[PDB]
Write a protein that binds this ligand. Structure first.
Ligand SMILES: Cc1nc2sc3c(c2c(=O)[nH]1)CCC3
Length: 188
């Protein structure tokens, strides 16, 4: 279930200049070793279904952003199979899951705290399609999606950010809200 393939994106492939250019806006001091495309049909189809629903509701809003997420090597196969979906006890009592964080700029995700260097010094950051939708600033203490309207408090925001008009990060909460399209492997 949610089987996947991994294909190297070569420097000569159409999308390389764009993916590398975005990473290099803030990470040009690192050296890129490989960029790969993650091809997971079930995960892609489910993400696209969520995108279609959001596009049909949010008017002019550009619901998708491409953001970064650094992780340790041991999490890579999990992300490739499951994306950023989470399962745990009591998830189904409430309308959302535990937040998953993404950065606007690659250098944030390139921190060793996130993209932990592996045994060979290799660091791993995904360039992820994320349905940011309609967002507000995150709660300071209760890390859940806030209500949009005190008169309708089960209607929740799609994501939260640190700063509504100058974001540096986004937090996603819902299933199939993100697709791990590209994996960038790099070194100091
Ligand atoms: C595992 C992981 N956690 C976090 S928290 C956070 C980011 C980030 C990441 O890239 N990976 C980037 C923005 C704030």
């Amino acid at each position: 279930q949610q089987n996947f393939c991994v294909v190297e994106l070569l420097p000569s492939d159409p999308e390389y200049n764009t993916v590398a250019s975005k990473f290099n806006q803030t990470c040009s001091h690192f050296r890129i070793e490989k960029i790969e495309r993650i091809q997971n049909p079930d995960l892609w189809n489910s993400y696209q279904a969520k995108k279609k629903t959001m596009d049909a509701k949010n008017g002019q809003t550009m619901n998708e952003k491409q953001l970064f997420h650094g992780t340790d090597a041991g999490s890579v196969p999990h992300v490739n199979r499951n994306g950023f979906n989470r399962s745990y006890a009591g998830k189904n009592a409430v309308a959302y899951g535990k937040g998953t964080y993404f950065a606007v700029n690659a250098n944030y995700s390139a921190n060793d705290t996130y993209s932990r260097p592996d045994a060979n010094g290799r660091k791993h950051v995904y360039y992820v399609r994320v349905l940011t939708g309609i967002y507000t600033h995150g709660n300071h203490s209760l890390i859940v999606p806030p209500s949009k309207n005190p008169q309708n408090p089960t209607d929740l925001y799609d994501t939260v950010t640190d700063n509504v008009h100058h974001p540096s990060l986004f937090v996603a909460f819902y299933d199939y809200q993100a697709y791990p399209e590209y994996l960038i492997t790099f070194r100091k």
